[PDB]
């Protein structure tokens, strides 16, 4: 039985699994008032990928395919391809193309295109509204609003690189993005399918532990806090190791290598999320060189030392 | 501890010189020019070299506060380290980790969040790594943007790379040059603490390159981007830290659908791969093929022709 373990990496050395940006800090908070069900950064401890989770960090919230537009519009419809530029399969038992955004918001990025005619290139500012009725990646279609009405060609490889999130600056619509609200992956009047399950602390006094990054904002006052259940490196590491789970709960200690002192302990659940013993919203204060260490498998009656 | 390389197909892995996925394998002659990239540099026992760091998303990014050049849409960025604490120029590395290791013009987005009340803004931005004012080792880089009024001073600012540009003409269609290092301290200075140049030493051998196509944002840039090791291999060696038992590790590229070996190659301790082939060649590989470490060999092992 191959022994289980987590990578020796500091928080800042790791990557958010829900947007291609580095981790910044750890956060814990109450989560009973809403549904926590992200589809990226979902992986079991024995290396089973869930939801829309794939291995590469750079591919989260990216799109590839060819685009079309009606005459003189700045809106382009992208017919999605799989990222290796082969055909996309809508029937495959997944919620949406692997790496698809798993929150409702406006993502701003750049739409680049290289034409096979002579190799010429071009890129323009583009925005995708993931809460739009016309956002249906599971059906293989998304729509971008851009800065051109003439420059992109049909039947040519086009890619979308995400940059950040936007907001109109006002107070009337200052509730976006909503990181815990999944899009309708197939468009209006449909239900999502093959979702990774929602998570919640069941043990009394416990809250989820979130790995937090700050999304860049390109305008106004967006919700830039972005929390994921596992760092992308853990997803990658579990997929590689595939160590059998000896129990439903793995005990992690967060250690400071400068002193060897344990700062806090936490539970890593088999299905792939972390909880701590704490009540209230809290930005954890951690030393620069700290990292997580797996110490043992425990039963389900283990009470964490308060954080 | 036994040495090994990850069970990952090429398409599942990431270029280590630009935040984009790998696409294919390429081999070619490299005696006519100097091969010395500083990103994706790692020894087999997990020691990072050059400007190489672990996260793929940080490659070719810049962080710091910006100042504005009057009578231009250009900004000077005073660099910070990735966690926004101060950057130390005295640290013995060629440049901040993740700094671009090629000469070309990179297009991306300059975003900023002001600490006064939290409002944000982003603008199209371009950095020329061959610029005289491109001096990352000194903690300064210069961006060209589409505004002259919108950014504020002493506020966290980030540059997100997207791709490379070229002016469309033939006169300057020689950029980017992926095998030409920038002058990290600005024009007419010498780089320091560089990871060494590599070359096949065994007769009949060529480097094996891990190739991606960079997004182009304008004109006809050089978009082929080759790295010596996948970012994941860097990540894996760093984690594994298996001591090298020899100077050369023999890898076989295997097709699991059939169990047959497609070709073999050398993975050198110093962190690069060579194959036995003469001439430029885009490798044809099965979708699920992967690399396998089979045994340590000496320096006199003759590879089966690829």
């Amino acid at each position: 039985s191959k022994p289980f373990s987590v990578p020796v990496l500091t928080v800042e050395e790791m990557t958010n699994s829900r947007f291609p940006i580095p981790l910044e800090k750890l956060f814990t908070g109450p989560s009973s008032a809403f549904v926590v069900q992200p589809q990226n950064g979902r992986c079991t401890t024995d290396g089973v990928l869930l939801g829309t989770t794939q291995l590469s960090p750079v591919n989260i919230c990216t799109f590839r395919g060819d685009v079309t537009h009606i005459t003189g519009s700045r809106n382009y419809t992208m017919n999605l391809a799989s990222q290796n530029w082969n055909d996309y399969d809508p029937t495959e038992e997944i919620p949406a193309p692997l790496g698809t955004p798993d929150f409702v918001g406006k993502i701003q990025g750049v739409l680049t295109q290289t034409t096979r005619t002579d190799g010429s290139t071009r890129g323009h500012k583009a925005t995708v509204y993931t809460g739009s009725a016309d956002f249906a990646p599971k059906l293989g279609r998304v729509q971008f609003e851009t800065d051109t009405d003439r420059d992109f060609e049909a039947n040519q490889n086009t890619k979308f690189t995400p940059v950040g999130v936007i907001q109109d600056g006002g107070t009337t619509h200052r509730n976006e993005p909503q990181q815990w609200v999944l899009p309708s992956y197939s468009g209006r009047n449909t239900h999502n399918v093959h979702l990774a399950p929602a998570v919640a602390p069941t043990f009394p006094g416990e809250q989820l532990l979130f790995f937090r990054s700050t999304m860049p904002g390109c305008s106004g006052y967006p919700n830039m806090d972005l929390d994921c259940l596992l760092p992308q490196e853990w997803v990658q590491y579990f997929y590689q190791e595939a160590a059998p789970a000896q129990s439903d709960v793995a005990l992690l200690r967060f250690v400071n290598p400068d002193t060897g002192r344990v700062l806090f302990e936490c539970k890593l659940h088999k299905s792939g999320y972390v909880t701590v013993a704490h009540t209230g919203q809290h930005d954890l204060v951690i030393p620069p060189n700290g990292y997580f260490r797996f110490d043992s498998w425990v039963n389900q009656f283990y009470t964490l030392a308060p954080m | 501890k036994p040495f090994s390389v990850p069970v990952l197909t090429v398409e599942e892995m990431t270029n280590s010189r630009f935040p984009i996925p790998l696409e294919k394998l390429f081999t070619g002659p490299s005696s006519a020019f100097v091969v010395q990239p500083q990103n994706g540099r790692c020894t087999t026992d997990g020691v990072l070299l050059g400007t190489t760091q672990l996260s793929p998303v940080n490659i070719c990014t810049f962080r710091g506060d910006v100042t504005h050049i009057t009578g231009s849409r250009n900004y000077t960025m005073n660099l910070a380290s990735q966690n926004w604490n101060d950057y130390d120029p005295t640290e013995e590395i060629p440049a901040p980790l993740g700094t671009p290791d090629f000469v070309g013009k990179i297009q991306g987005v300059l975003t900023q969040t002001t600490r006064t009340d939290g409002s944000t803004r982003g603008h199209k931005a371009t950095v020329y790594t061959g610029s005289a004012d491109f001096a990352p080792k000194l903690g300064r880089v210069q961006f060209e943007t589409d505004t002259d009024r919108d950014f504020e001073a002493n506020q966290n600012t980030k540059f997100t790379p997207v791709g490379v540009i070229q002016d469309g003409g033939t006169t300057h269609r020689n950029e980017p040059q992926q095998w030409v290092l920038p002058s990290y301290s600005g024009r007419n200075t010498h780089n320091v603490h560089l990871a060494p140049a590599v070359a096949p030493t065994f007769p009949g051998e060529q480097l094996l390159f891990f190739r991606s196509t960079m997004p182009g944002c304008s004109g006809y840039p050089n978009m082929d981007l080759d790295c010596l090791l996948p970012q994941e291999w860097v990540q894996y060696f760093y984690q594994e830290a298996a001591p090298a038992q020899s100077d050369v590790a023999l890898l076989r590229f295997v097709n699991p659908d059939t169990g047959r070996v497609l070709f073999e190659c050398k993975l050198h301790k110093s962190g690069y791969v060579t194959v036995a082939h003469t001439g430029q060649h885009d490798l044809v590989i099965p979708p699920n093929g992967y690399f396998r470490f089979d045994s340590w060999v000496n320096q006199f092992y003759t590879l089966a022709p690829m």
Partner: antibody, heavy 116, light 107 residues
Framework: QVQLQQSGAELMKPGASVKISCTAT????????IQWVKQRPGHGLEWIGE????????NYNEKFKGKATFTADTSSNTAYMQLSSLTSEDSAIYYC?????????WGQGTTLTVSS | QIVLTQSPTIMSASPGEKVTMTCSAS?????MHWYQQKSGTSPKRWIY???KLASGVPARFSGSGSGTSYSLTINSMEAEDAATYYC?????????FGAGTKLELKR
């Protein structure tokens, strides 16, 4: 996808100036550079220069700086090259070309003959 | 300027022969490109970035080289291939072509 149409054959006396037309269809004209190339029977291909129509941007081969002038009429999608002070060594086939990375688009060519 | 010297200036081949023509540069270049031209028609970009094939170019063609020495190769000559081939360079302005290699057919 692109087509370049050039003006007809020209026959000029020495010392005159000729203006050759290159009309581009199939793309946004002011977005691509036009290259101009000279071809003499025993002298292979020679690059005159390039220009980006509607903008001031031009790059001349030093040998032709002062001989060839590039202008454009963007309304009409036409690029022009003017050659001044014609001598017999200007007798050649002249091409306009949109030269890309992987493929090109060349005009059909314009034959110029200079003679007394 | 970068002078490209092609060799041979003219040659002939039987259908099926292996054909090789070379380009030598006065200075180093990063990529070499090749053009095909037939009598009465404009030049067509044949090989670009040293080894990559342009549109419509048969798999029997190939290119190789680095620094100052490059070559174009046809593993099996066909009648369709009889034409004149020019090599071409971008590394230094001005852009330059070689004088050309005239390929004729044997019979």
């Amino acid at each position: 996808q692109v087509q370049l149409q050039q003006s007809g054959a020209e026959l000029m006396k020495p010392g005159a100036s000729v203006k050759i037309s290159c009309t581009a269809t199939g793309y946004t004209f002011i977005t691509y550079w036009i290259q101009w190339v000279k071809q003499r029977p025993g002298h292979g291909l020679e690059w005159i220069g390039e220009t980006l129509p509607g903008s001031g941007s031009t790059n001349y081969n030093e040998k032709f700086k002062g001989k060839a002038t590039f202008t454009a009429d963007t309304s009409s999608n036409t690029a022009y090259m003017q050659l001044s002070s014609l001598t017999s060594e200007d007798s050649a086939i002249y091409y306009c070309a949109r030269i890309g990375r992987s493929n090109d688009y060349w005009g059909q060519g314009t034959t110029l003959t200079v003679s007394s | 300027q970068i002078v490209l010297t092609q060799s041979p200036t003219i040659m002939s081949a039987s259908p099926g022969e292996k054909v090789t023509m070379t380009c030598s540069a006065s200075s180093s270049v990063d990529y070499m490109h090749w053009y095909q031209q037939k009598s009465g028609t404009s030049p067509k970009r044949w090989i670009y970035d040293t080894y990559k094939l342009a549109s419509g170019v048969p798999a029997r063609f190939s290119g190789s080289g680095s620094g100052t020495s490059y070559s174009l190769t046809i593993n099996s000559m066909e009648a369709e291939d009889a034409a004149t081939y020019y090599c071409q360079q971008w590394s230094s302005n001005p852009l330059t072509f070689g004088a050309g290699t005239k390929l004729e057919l044997k019979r």
